Amino acid sequence: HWGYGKHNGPEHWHKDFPIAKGERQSPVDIDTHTAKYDPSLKPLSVSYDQATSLRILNNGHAFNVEFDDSQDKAVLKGGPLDGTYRLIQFHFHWGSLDGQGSEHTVDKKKYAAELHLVHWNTKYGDFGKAVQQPDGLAVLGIFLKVGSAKPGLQKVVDVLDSIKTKGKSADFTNFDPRGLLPESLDYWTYPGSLTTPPLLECVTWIVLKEPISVSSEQVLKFRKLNFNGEGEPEELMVDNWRPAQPLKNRQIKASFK
Ligand SMILES: [Zn+2]
């Protein structure tokens, strides 16, 4: 029912999902001057060498690249986190135009897209239990700007023709998510929420400062996807981003000076 249109978009979500107006909603604007450097924060540990990608799915709101999360194969630890978080999927948010698409903003700057690598806290046993907990998820967010191509993204781009419409999936084995990371792991962190319904307040957000560059041709392929199912009126999958929400009683911390 929910989506990104005039009639079912982010300004309507609160009617079915009242937590939409809650105290720890995401995304937010990152005001770089008021974020506090926190010397007690640790380097992030991204351990993706044994990652096992399985499948790519058009779910009607984005496409998800799904992983085997039945063992500790691709995990996030350190940084602001206690314990071990397993990678379950990644997906993107993007615009109809290069001047919009990201969910987080930086001093009100919107990027062309934003990658979310979604991980759940192994102490809760599965994703569905983790989303019911205030420290259940850790989401690594990475900005995309348009410039040079990202070679590690092209295998994703090239499979999108096979999953044009809602409900389509394709085999997507042997994909290495290390090829989507920038050089630096410097980050901001704050407590927040899922950015799609059910909007649960279960996320430790870790947003990298350094964007990756992708080509205009790469992002143009994202914008050829469809929100609709096969045989239905074509609606391009663009502008699948929630705008910045009120920060309320939260502090954004920086890992770097
Ligand atoms: Zn997302």
Side-chain angles (χ1 to χ4, degrees):
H1 173 73
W2 67 269
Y4 292 98
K6 331 95 269 310
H7 301 287
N8 70 356
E11 304 308 308
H12 293 273
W13 294 352
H14 73 98
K15 294 173 277 173
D16 284 318
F17 303 99
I19 203 174
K21 295 185 189 288
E23 297 308 299
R24 64 172 274 195
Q25 292 289 292
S26 294
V28 299
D29 184 56
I30 303 165
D31 190 81
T32 66
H33 285 104
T34 59
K36 172 79 177 169
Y37 169 61
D38 185 349
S40 84
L41 283 171
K42 302 169 209 298
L44 267 185
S45 175
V46 183
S47 306
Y48 286 170
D49 43 290
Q50 292 298 116
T52 297
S53 68
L54 292 175
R55 194 180 69 137
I56 191 172
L57 172 70
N58 181 327
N59 61 22
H61 311 278
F63 64 86
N64 289 356
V65 176
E66 299 167 349
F67 289 78
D68 176 10
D69 61 352
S70 68
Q71 299 184 261
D72 283 351
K73 282 182 170 188
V75 299
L76 186 67
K77 306 169 51 57
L81 304 174
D82 288 340
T84 300
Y85 291 71
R86 290 196 188 152
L87 181 64
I88 181 169
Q89 52 94 347
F90 71 76
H91 59 276
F92 304 77
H93 307 263
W94 62 96
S96 54
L97 304 156
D98 296 351
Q100 64 197 39
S102 69
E103 292 206 308
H104 294 89
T105 57
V106 178
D107 295 336
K108 298 300 180 76
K109 178 188 174 65
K110 296 175 165 78
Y111 287 86
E114 186 176 327
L115 166 61
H116 288 162
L117 295 127
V118 180
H119 312 75
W120 58 272
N121 191 332
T122 59
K123 81 193 211 159
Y124 303 122
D126 71 54
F127 179 81
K129 284 292 200 165
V131 299
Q132 298 179 63
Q133 314 299 329
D135 57 353
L137 296 195
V139 182
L140 181 56
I142 305 179
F143 298 119
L144 281 60
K145 69 178 186 178
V146 175
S148 304
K150 192 64 167 183
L153 181 62
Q154 191 61 31
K155 274 162 70 160
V156 174
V157 161
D158 276 337
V159 81
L160 296 181
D161 272 350
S162 72
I163 60 151
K164 184 178 173 175
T165 52
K166 178 179 178 182
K168 291 200 74 175
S169 68
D171 185 282
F172 202 67
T173 55
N174 306 106
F175 180 76
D176 186 351
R178 289 175 295 187
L180 300 176
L181 303 179
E183 281 179 10
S184 177
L185 294 179
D186 289 347
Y187 64 87
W188 296 286
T189 187
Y190 75 97
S193 76
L194 309 180
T195 67
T196 52
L199 299 171
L200 292 171
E201 291 179 340
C202 61
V203 180
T204 303
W205 276 98
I206 301 165
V207 176
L208 296 192
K209 174 164 176 179
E210 183 179 2
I212 61 167
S213 295
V214 303
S215 66
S216 57
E217 293 88 359
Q218 289 180 317
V219 72
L220 286 162
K221 289 185 186 188
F222 286 13
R223 299 181 182 130
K224 293 178 60 183
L225 289 166
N226 290 182
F227 287 126
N228 57 279
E230 184 181 8
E232 296 174 358
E234 191 169 7
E235 307 172 80
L236 293 181
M237 183 179 285
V238 295
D239 294 319
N240 60 348
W241 50 282
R242 189 185 192 192
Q245 300 300 311
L247 188 63
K248 298 189 166 164
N249 186 39
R250 292 179 289 178
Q251 285 197 333
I252 305 184
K253 293 171 182 189
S255 77
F256 59 93
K257 262 193 269 190

